Amino acid sequence: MYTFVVRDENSSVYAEVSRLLLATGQWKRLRKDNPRFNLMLGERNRLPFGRLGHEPGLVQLVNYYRGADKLCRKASLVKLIKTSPELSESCTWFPESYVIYPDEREVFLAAYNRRREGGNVWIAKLISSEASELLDFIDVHVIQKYLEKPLLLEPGHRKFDIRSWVLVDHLYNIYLYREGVLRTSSEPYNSANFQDKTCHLTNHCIQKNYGRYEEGNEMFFEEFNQYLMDALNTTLENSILLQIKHIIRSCLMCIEPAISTKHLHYQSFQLFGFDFMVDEELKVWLIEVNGAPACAQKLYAELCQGIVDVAISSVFPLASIFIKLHH
Amino acid sequence: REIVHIQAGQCGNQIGAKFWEVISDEHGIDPTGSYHGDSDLQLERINVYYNEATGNKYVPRAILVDLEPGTMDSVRSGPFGQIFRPDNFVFGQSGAGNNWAKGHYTEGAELVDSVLDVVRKESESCDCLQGFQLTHSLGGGTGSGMGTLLISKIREEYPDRIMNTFSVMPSPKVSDTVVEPYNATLSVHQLVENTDETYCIDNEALYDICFRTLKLTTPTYGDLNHLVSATMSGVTTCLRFPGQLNADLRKLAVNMVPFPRLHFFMPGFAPLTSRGSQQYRALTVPELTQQMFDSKNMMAACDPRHGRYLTVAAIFRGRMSMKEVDEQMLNVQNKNSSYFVEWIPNNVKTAVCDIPPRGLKMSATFIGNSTAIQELFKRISEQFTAMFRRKAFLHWYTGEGMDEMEFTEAESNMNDLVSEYQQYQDA
Amino acid sequence: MRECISIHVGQAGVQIGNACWELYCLEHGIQPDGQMPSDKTIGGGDDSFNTFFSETGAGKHVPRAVFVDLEPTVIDEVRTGTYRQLFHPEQLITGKEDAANNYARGHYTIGKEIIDLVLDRIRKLADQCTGLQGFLVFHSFGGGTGSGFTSLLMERLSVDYGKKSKLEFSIYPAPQVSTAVVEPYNSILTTHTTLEHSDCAFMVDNEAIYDICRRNLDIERPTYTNLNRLISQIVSSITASLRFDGALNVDLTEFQTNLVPYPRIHFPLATYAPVISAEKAYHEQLSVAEITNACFEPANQMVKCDPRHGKYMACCLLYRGDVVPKDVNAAIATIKTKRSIQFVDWCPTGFKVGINYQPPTVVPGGDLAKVQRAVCMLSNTTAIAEAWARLDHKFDLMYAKRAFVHWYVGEGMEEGEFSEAREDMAALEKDYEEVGV
Amino acid sequence: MEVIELNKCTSGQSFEVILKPPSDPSLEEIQKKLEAAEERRKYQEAELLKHLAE
Ligand SMILES: Nc1nc2c(ncn2[C@@H]2O[C@H](COP(=O)(O)OP(=O)(O)OP(=O)(O)O)[C@@H](O)[C@H]2O)c(=O)[nH]1
Ligand SMILES: Nc1ncnc2c1ncn2[C@@H]1O[C@H](COP(=O)(O)OP(=O)(O)CP(=O)(O)O)[C@@H](O)[C@H]1O
Ligand SMILES: Nc1nc2c(ncn2[C@@H]2O[C@H](COP(=O)(O)OP(=O)(O)O)[C@@H](O)[C@H]2O)c(=O)[nH]1
Ligand SMILES: COc1ccc2c(c1)NC(=O)CN2c1nc(Cl)nc2c1CCC2
Ligand SMILES: [Ca+2]
Ligand SMILES: [Mg+2]
Ligand SMILES: [Mg+2]
Ligand SMILES: [Mg+2]
Secondary structure (H helix, E strand, O other): EEEEOOOOOOOEEEEHHHHHHHOOOEEEEOOEEEOOOOOOEEOOOOOOOHHHHOOOOOOOEEEEOOOOHHHHHHHHHHHHHHOOOOOOOOOOOOOOOOEEEEOOHHHHHHHHHHHHHOOOOEOOOOEOOHOEEEEEEEEOOOEEEEEOEEEEOOOOOOEEEEEEEEEEOOOEEEEEOOOOEEEEEEOOOOOOOOOOOOOOOOOOOOOOOOOOHHHHHEEEHHHHHHHHHHOOOHHHHHHHHHHHHHHHHHHHHHHHHHHOOOOOOEEOOEEEEEEEEEEEEEEEEEEEEEEEOOOOOHHHHHHHHHHHHHEEEOOOOOOOOEEEEOO | OOOEEEHHHHHHHHHHHHHHHHHHHHHHEEEOOOOOOOOOOOOOOOHHHHHEEOOOEEEEEEEEOOOOOHHHHHOOOOOOHHOOOOOHEEEEOOOOOOOOHHHHOOOOHHHHHHHHHHHHHHOOOOOOOOEEEEEEEOOOHHHHHHOOOOOHHHHHOOOOEEEEEEEEOEEEEEEOOOHHHHHHHHHHHHHHHHOOOEEEEHHHHHHHHHHHHHHOOOHHHHHHHHHHHHHHHHHHHHHHHHHHHHHHOHHHHHHHHOOOOOOEEEEEEEEEOOOOOOOOOOOHHHHHHHHHHHHHEOOOOOOOOHOOEEEEEEEEOOOOHHHHHHHHHHHHHHHHHHHHHOOOOOHHHHHEEEOOOOOOEEEEEEEEEEEEHHHHHHHHHHHHHHHHOOOOOOHHHHHHOOHHHHHHHHHHHHHHHHHHHHHHHHH | OOEEEEEHHHEEEEHHHHHHHHHHHHOOOOOOOOOOOOOOOOOOOOOHHOOOOOOOOOEEEEEEEOOOEEEOOHHHHHHHOOOOOOOOOHEEOOOOOOOOOOOOHHHHHHHHHHHHHHHHHHHHHHHHHOOOOOEEEEOOOHHEEEEEEEHHHHHHHHHHHOOEEEEEEEOOOOOOOOOOOOHHHHHHHHHHHHHHHHOOEEEEEEHHHHHHHHHHOOOOOOOHHHHHHHHHHHHHHHHHHOOOOOOOOOOHHHHHHHHOOOOOOOOOOEEEEEEEEOOOOOOOOOOOHHHHHHHHOHHHHHOOOOOOHHHEEEEEEEEEOOOOHHHHHHHHHHHHHHHOOOOOOOOOEEEEEEOOOOOOOOOOOOOOOOOOEEEEEEEHHHHHHHHHHHHHHHHHHHOOOOOOHHHHHHHOOOOOHHHHHHHHHHHHHHHHHHHOO | OOEEEEEEOOOOEEEEEEEOOOOOOOOOHHHHHHHHHHHHHHHHHHHHHHHHHH
């Protein structure tokens, strides 16, 4: 048998990975503080990476990549894109973003005053124009250009965001789950006032007109691909998914030298949640990356099974739903 | 680093004589004391258990104690009896009559000063004395009562030395008298206080092994002592032989005893063999590891799955892959990690010796400080109370000056020992 | 010339001293009887090798070393070994009974018996010095003698030699080769008592040396002889600048100045490459760039940790063999672009390079193969605090139950010194995280 | 890359490369605690010999 421990009871994804592993009959679960494990489904904060890979006679594996928070914090993501030459300051798929503390203020207001000449709606993380109001709201936050012309689904005139689940295994193969989800807004997009943000914030919890067009404000790829065909005369693969696969590959390949566990004494994999924003001209924008993402109820069974097949059983074999992004 | 061996009583002298027979053969010494071996590994640490006398003879640093001349006369008549220094035979005439009080308070008090004289004479000749090891039973009178009287008096004169014991626990399956739980409870009270290491050799376990495993229908004391002398040889291997671990009694006590009162070890041996019958297939390293941890190879009738291992010491003897030993030992710990306390990291240390015991090409000896040893003390505390609740047979002891209160205190202290082992089984 | 005295304590210290002095003699051409034919100044001199060796009128070259073990069997193998003539009997000190893996027994009980005798024999070597600069102490964290008696010695050396530097070569405990279960206790206790008395300490995790011997030397079950020969190579690289002509790390003070900006954070990480098996029939020799790139692989470090998730405070490169400055800068240029090398903001991002043209020496019949060029990198990275976290976690597990504490209290120690020592370690981990985030 | 302080000799050479600029207790107290622990040993041994005397 292989052994594993669970150090994040709040994880809905790896709660199902625990059940799948146990139902194999070849995985035994130990207690939190038992060091003789093969696999660690560790905590989200202060994961003791320094204690991994020091047990003789045990190949150890963990479901997190040490150093990947540089991509999963809004402040760290902006710094990573501005400073890394692989992404460059002139990154075409990331919105203009500046970091301000309760900072780059001088460099920020330099562009906001060039907006006076012209669209100058920004978001901080909330949504405002002119921006002098927003700074006092902050009083660490990141301000970012709010995309004023997003792609609006019909019927409804609705906003949305695209969530893609990406798995990076111990060999740094980048696997993209073929099933995504559009977390839509059930309210019609009103660009007249941003104080009312039920039609702007596409968060699921912010929606609680909910549930009108599709169940749970979740449109999957089967339906959304058919809509693009009928309405815009194109497919999801050509118009959106190529840019999504390019962004996912660019972000992860940038930080590979700093998180890779190829020659380490322990091994790492991690599931990521990339959130994309499609605009009026079928251009994809990266909003943020999630280090501990939750799935959708319909896809938990298929995705968590794939995590075991690709990320766990590849290192601990027993007795495809992913699109490999090549590099 | 010399060790002084003491054997007290009938049982103590019979297993002690077998122990000296077994390790003398392993070290190439013959009954006359002359060395006729072939390897230099034998004599490198021969001084730990042997004194070098005139004419390049090797005299065992052993003292033979009994309140009867019966068993000790059989030792001097035995196959190796002529190797023992004749002055080290100290014996009375009355006997202890399976009575802890006679050995500890009356009959043994007369003789104990004579033993300490011989003990002192051997200790003054020692370059650096590690400590003492006593073989005895806890069910009789001499080895039990006088044995603990010696240990109490030895600790008074050598308070900074290690006290090691091989203590045979009584069992109704192999019973001499009904007062054995009385003698054992009084003795365990002494062992909890005045020893650093005690190997619990349960006669119940030795019988079950002889009966269930070795397929011996009517086991004798000779069939039981074969298992004892094989176990005694195995646990003392890293003391008698050179290797990567040249160990002494103190380092053993330091690394095996996390709390002073919990120093009662479960011995284990593999492969289990019967006298006069040799099996011809050598065990693979996975088999030695599988059996030495099996409860059917434990010399103390305890289920190790009912407790947790505080510390474990393992000895492999023979020509084998040390890498395969490391893999198998790590395989047991990682496959049954719930039975090893997590608050003592890496509590299993393994050693390997190239010299195998007589009659085997590969062997494995197990030393376990497990909280499951409480089952042994629970068993004795039950047999004790069944009689003491009616004060039965107590007149044999009160006639020697003992009061009922001393029995109550001994019963209480052992029940505290059981509850203390229970404290760390839940933690 | 300024002399250095080496002190080896316990089994790990003595046996590693045997490995180093065996290697030193081969590098300087000194023979087991102490003769040095290349030395033309008979009976004296002030060359660079005289830092580690004195000279007698007969031409013998005596190491400025003292061996001390509370138990004689290890030093007895030195007294009768291949280099028996090399040492004077007075610099080999043994007791009768050892510390039994007990820090408190080595520091208090048995240590008090012999501390004055050792300091006197140490005084004998210091009086032969025209200008002593300090000491090099070899010991283990886990041993009762290597931890207990060393801390008592390090306290007294700050008294009798307050102006001298003191460097440590410490063996961090690894269960694959360790024989004691209480080694986390001894490690924390000795690090706390020694911390303010050591100016620079080079830790060597036996787990790292073990796996290097398995991976790169094709040894299934490495022994102390295998480990200590590899350790001596690293130590020789570190001390080569004190024994040879050069301008980098020429005295013990320069080790602290170059590698230790903060007195407490004085644990540089050592990486070494290449380690090549002597049984390798066909070997393609590695270039300057290849072996410099290997200095940033964790699999070649003396302590397994991830320097990508810390910050450097200093960085030395000590080369041995066919190396020229041109090839080093070209290698550093390539490596800086491909690897995460983050320095603290109050330090310049750079490397101090030292090159010795004599290629690394290997003992005949040893496991290591001769190479054209090799390098030892000394980097003061905060990632080495991972070893303290591991060690303190094992300490926390045992001490929560007070397991084995009675053995230490029974030697005269007080239970409070446990928590006192653990508090200092909790402060050391705190200092590393401040500098490293 | 600035290569500074280049020293050379027959044995070898040394230099420095910069890629970017920046942004005890006394013998009295030792003997005192060594004897305070021996006192704690003598006391524990006396309580043992007193217990064995009873
Ligand atoms: N690298 C290396 N480690 C060693 C060597 N000898 C012992 N060790 C390590 O040292 C630790 C035990 O310390 P020792 O040096 O053996 O003990 P000691 O210093 O003599 O102290 P005591 O024997 O307890 O009195 C274990 O973790 C061993 O792995 C050696 O020769 N080389
Ligand atoms: N630059 C931008 N332009 C337009 N809309 C934006 C935007 N940034 C964020 N939004 C909208 O605001 C919503 C919430 O933003 P954000 O993703 O940063 O918060 P969050 O972290 O709570 C969601 P999660 O963590 O689950 O991915 C997004 O889903 C998107 O609809
Ligand atoms: N294993 C073993 N047990 C024995 C032997 N002789 C006696 N015993 C046990 O010891 C107890 C009797 O004590 P004994 O040693 O004969 O009395 P003593 O002479 O006063 O010490 C009983 O429980 C017996 O089962 C022996 O040779 N081997
Ligand atoms: C739990 O961890 C332990 C356990 C036991 C010991 C040690 C550590 N270390 C020692 O030095 C003594 N020792 C031993 N002693 C003796 Cl006679 N035989 C053996 C060992 C180890 C195995 C064989
Ligand atoms: Ca000279
Ligand atoms: Mg988020
Ligand atoms: Mg009898
Ligand atoms: Mg030692």
